[PDB]
Design a protein around this ligand. Structure first.
Ligand SMILES: NC(=O)c1ccc[n+]([C@@H]2O[C@H](COP(=O)([O-])OP(=O)(O)OC[C@H]3O[C@@H](n4cnc5c(N)ncnc54)[C@H](O)[C@@H]3O)[C@@H](O)[C@H]2O)c1
Ligand SMILES: NC(=O)c1ccc[n+]([C@@H]2O[C@H](COP(=O)([O-])OP(=O)(O)OC[C@H]3O[C@@H](n4cnc5c(N)ncnc54)[C@H](O)[C@@H]3O)[C@@H](O)[C@H]2O)c1
Ligand SMILES: NC(=O)c1ccc[n+]([C@@H]2O[C@H](COP(=O)([O-])OP(=O)(O)OC[C@H]3O[C@@H](n4cnc5c(N)ncnc54)[C@H](O)[C@@H]3O)[C@@H](O)[C@H]2O)c1
Ligand SMILES: NC(=O)c1ccc[n+]([C@@H]2O[C@H](COP(=O)([O-])OP(=O)(O)OC[C@H]3O[C@@H](n4cnc5c(N)ncnc54)[C@H](O)[C@@H]3O)[C@@H](O)[C@H]2O)c1
Lengths: 334, 334, 334, 334
């Protein structure tokens, strides 16, 4: 239905493409990176994390060919030269990781695009959205550069929403044991973050995260009530959020879990899931939801302090949300 | 000085041996396991985590020879047959992981030993000790089966003591992002804990930890106030404790860090350490302290909820504490 | 059609079960291990390597239930008490790793089974078979305890057969860069093989392998002409054989590759595959063939010496061959 | 004694710096990279692979301060702006990986340096040297841009030299199971080499190498007789060479090992080592020799074909050879 372009055909760019392949209302007509079609096709076909792409992939000139459909391949380092308008691209998924500033992402609009979805926390964006939490705040008239936040925020926000509405969150802190990403390093290389500069597959690497405070962007009532950190570990994909919060209402483990299960079946179905199985990260590789409560981990002290653990495939879940947001934004008229 | 025997020459047994080599007051004269001297000598000399042992290691008959001293090698799976008495062994380090219950650990006493140190949380032990927290409670007359707790409790207890004494802990929850251990599995094998049954180097594995509740054993005032869990990750060694606690007094990050640093350079020197550097797990491999505060991670919300993160080499640190405890127990008379 | 029993429901045991689910001619009616039905069910449903099993799995009493079919679960350490006869099991897949000697595997026969397939190299087996190479040598009247060799031998034999037949192998050496298995150790632990005793996910570990010499059992003309070793590395599954051989004829890379593809498309279709794609180990996870030639790696030096590289999913490919062998054996009369 | 500059303060650059701190004849007065002094100092102080540097490290403006010594820090992307001459730098270690072509490496000469050592195979270099094999071929008057070959070639050449002199090599093929390096990728990213584009810590990754070919550069008699490949695996450091060669005469494992042991204790002392211990990769971390024979792995088939396996710490060993070459080149006059 709506024509979409993807700038930065990497981990999120390609997984967003995989997700788009399952959404008939979304059509990816062009992608942009810093290599050639042959390379992007090879990477799209064979994935070290999600296996071979269950589709036909080939190349024809500067175009990828998936199931007969041709996708234009561009290699413009400067997004202002993408000429999105000429090929009718309305929504651009900005996932290079280099253009999170509005002034930069806005270059896509200058190139003829209508809307831009930054696949990460942004700066000076017109608004930040987390599907299932605040998409109703999207304004087609005033919002052109939208942030889909981070995978961590998309995992926490949904169940933070439930805990707050049902029991009221006074204050809380979280840690996300997160798999490594391409923003880290193989073997001790320069990095603005001296922790992320260290060999990713050899250590537990503490690093900051704005996910806790970013939750306030989608749930204003939580402003100043949350904070947290991250710990990158030697796993290629799938992460988990560990939240410890003080509640206004006195609760039991059963009550907390019941409320999370109810939200997973109702308001947040497809966004928040609920599991009573003793699973591990590998089990969630490929999961499309944004957050899956690990019910067995739920605990409470004095009926006022609770710990909630939730899984999330930082690649697949987030990419699906990006597509859901694309379709949602389009449904409001471009 | 004091004659020591080690039952279960594994990760702790061997690292305890390395630490013993550095203390003139403790002499390891015999070790017991389930293999021959050739095998134990090879494992002792070459370590995948701690490098080559800086000492001369050889074999005479079926006994070990380290720096000119002969170490008797036994291979009895039933501790009752160890005859520690015949060779003047007074203190036995029980580190097989199979004899944490008093009925099993006491067999060493039945066999001639005077004191037994269980290298883990125990059952029906005379007392559980964490050096730097409650070794003063040790009574040579009434205590014969002693537990040195777990590495996690040895990491948490030291700073929980500082936090409670200086600000007062109302309640709190912790999570330890822990390296995998020999209790886990290489590739999905049967295990009582269905999570620990899964490929250890492939996932983030949520599992239990008695550390939080065990802290009450050495700090009774914290009874019923703490709880937690563990996340086993793909690293071979070094772990980290993440504590989120509600304090009684209002505090600032600087006040919390100052108290921890004071204790680290004061009363808990050698046990608790304090670091303001942005380091990673590999950097703590070989660390001999029981707990190192990652000061850069300390945070506070509403001046009441605090997060404290502490590193610990679960093998080296704990092993050193086992030896310190042995020397301490010996100093009180056998 | 034929009722099959699996002794040792581990990596091979369970992956053989998966393969059997896709073969209407073989029905697994019972499995034996050292744990309960709940544990085996959990392990069968969630695999850290091959993902979630696409089938309904539940427990009923002390039995398993897969897609409405009930699978009997036993927990007999001694195979002689399995009572295969009483439940009509004619073929037993011996995959515990503890009964590779004929006298031990034969205990299944005393228990009522008619044929035993040892899922590994054996001792005193009536015959060793590699599907696609010598199944024609199987004699229903004289062969009751059959070995399906190792995964490495199943990978090498097929193309060693092609090379010898087309160009004649004078002599050769092979090395298999093999993923770790459950016969190794998580962290330096006693092991008859001092190399396999070392932390499996931490090093490149040289270890012996009888695959090269075993090829002689399925290809007699190669007796005394091949030898090799293995190198265990930090990967969970998928291995690769590296064969260097002196040939009788002088050849070119194109000639060698062409002959391998001819065999893959004809004589050994389904057993030997041919690939001209620049892939990596992850890409072969799930591959059901016994051997896939990495054509881009083929190399020839000074006309007479060649290097051929072939991939193989040591779990999936081998398990499918076990099932193919069971079906083949059954087609000859039980 | 001789003033040295390091271009590309990375894995080799920093480890070369470590080796130089041990050689009184080599004085590193400046290093160049693409970051700030604080970052380089931090990376030099804490190494994820080799541990904390045993020296005092601090920063003073644009200088590193190691044990009171001032080390100038530059950040010039273009080698021609380095002005080595102005600071008396005579020998430059080119270890960025971007200037292996003579035309590029020569830029250091234009900037005032007298000699350039390319820490890798090069293009149109004046000469390629492997200490212990052909340093005697270095000509101070004609050789200004020298290559110290690869770590792999430094491992193979020394023992290939012994085998050829003692038995005569007809032809041979090699494979080096190599730890991953910074030229690879964390998670499937564009790369000219489609194999190296794949997640490095997740697969066995075949990749080409001219190491066996480069041997002819230092041992001209082996021209056209060798070739090989590489296999990158999930280990951070330490690699191993696996050579299979056809000899001009029949030999036994004992004779091959005896000749290798003799050379390691004689002519190649310090370059070639010999071990009869059953070790693994982690055991060689820190090894300063270029090649250590794993005697237990030596094999021979049909009298004329041998397999020799040798270990090498690709970072430490090679870095030491770089320093050795610098001292050697200086001793010949600048
Ligand atoms: N990986 C995750 O788990 C995850 C989850 C949620 C959000 N994100 C966010 O998504 C963004 C991308 O992350 P990723 O993990 O996919 O990174 P990545 O490194 O895998 O992909 C980035 C891609 O963009 C390309 N690129 C870089 N500069 C370019 C330019 N100037 N023009 C065109 N293409 C260019 C790169 O070649 C690469 O293919 C980041 O902002 C990140 O924070 C990542
Ligand atoms: N690894 C850590 O981080 C850590 C830290 C603190 C405490 N611990 C505790 O220490 C104990 C041992 O742990 P580990 O990691 O050293 O385990 P391990 O598996 O590495 O070592 C156990 C050793 O005991 C031997 N053994 C087993 N049964 C025996 C028996 N019946 N008789 C004699 N020897 C026997 C084994 O062969 C092995 O060498 C456990 O109770 C564990 O919880 C572990
Ligand atoms: N894993 C591979 O890549 C591979 C490939 C080809 C062949 N094999 C061979 O297959 C065999 C099994 O290998 P694996 O990797 O599946 O091993 P594994 O350790 O994963 O499985 C062995 C199973 O047998 C069970 N067991 C042990 N003793 C038993 C007994 N006495 N009675 C009943 N059950 C028992 C264990 O609990 C476990 O579930 C070995 O002989 C091995 O050499 C392995
Ligand atoms: N790592 C090994 O095992 C090994 C062994 C022997 C030789 N080598 C070779 O040594 C070279 C470097 O390898 P490495 O592993 O140290 O790489 P690395 O990526 O760790 O280090 C390269 C360094 O150079 C810097 N750099 C890049 N371009 C630069 C420029 N234009 N100017 C100044 N600095 C620049 C990078 O910031 C980095 O610090 C390569 O040619 C490689 O093939 C590597």
């Amino acid at each position: 239905a709506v024509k979409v372009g993807i700038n930065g055909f990497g981990r999120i760019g390609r997984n967003v493409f995989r997700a788009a392949l399952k959404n008939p209302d979304i059509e990816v007509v062009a992608v942009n990176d810093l290599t050639d079609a042959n390379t992007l096709a090879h990477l799209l076909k064979y994935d070290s994390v999600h296996g071979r792409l269950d589709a036909e992939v080939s190349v024809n000139g500067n175009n990828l060919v998936v199931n007969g459909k041709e996708i234009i391949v561009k290699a413009e380092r400067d997004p202002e030269n993408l000429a999105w308008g000429e090929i009718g691209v309305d929504i651009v998924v900005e996932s290079t990781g280099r253009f999170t500033k509005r002034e930069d992402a806005a270059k896509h609009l200058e190139a003829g695009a209508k809307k831009v979805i930054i696949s990460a926390p942004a700066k000076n964006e017109d608004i930040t959205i987390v599907m299932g939490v605040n998409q109703d705040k999207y304004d087609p008239k005033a919002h052109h550069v939208i942030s889909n936040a981070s995978a961590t925020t998309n995992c926490l926000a949904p169940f933070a929403k439930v805990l707050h509405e049902q029991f009221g969150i006074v204050r809380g802190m979280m840690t996300t044991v997160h798999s490594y990403t391409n923003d880290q390093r193989i073997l001790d290389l320069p990095h603005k973050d001296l922790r992320r500069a260290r060999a990713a597959a050899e250590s537990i690497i503490p690093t900051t995260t704005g996910a806790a405070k970013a939750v306030a962007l989608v749930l204003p009532e939580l402003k100043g009530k949350l904070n947290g950190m991250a710990m990158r570990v030697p796993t290629p994909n799938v992460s988990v959020v560990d939240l410890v919060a003080e509640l206004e209402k006195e609760v039991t483990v059963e009550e907390v879990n019941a409320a999370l299960k109810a939200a997973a079946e109702g308001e947040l179905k497809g966004i928040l899931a609920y599991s009573e199985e003793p699973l591990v990260s590998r089990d969630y590789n490929g999961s499309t939801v944004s957050s899956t409560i690990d019910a067995l981990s739920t605990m409470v002290i004095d009926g006022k302090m609770v710990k909630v653990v939730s899984w999330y495939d930082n690649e697949t879940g987030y990419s699906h949300r990006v597509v859901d947001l694309a379709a949602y934004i389009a449904s409001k008229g471009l």
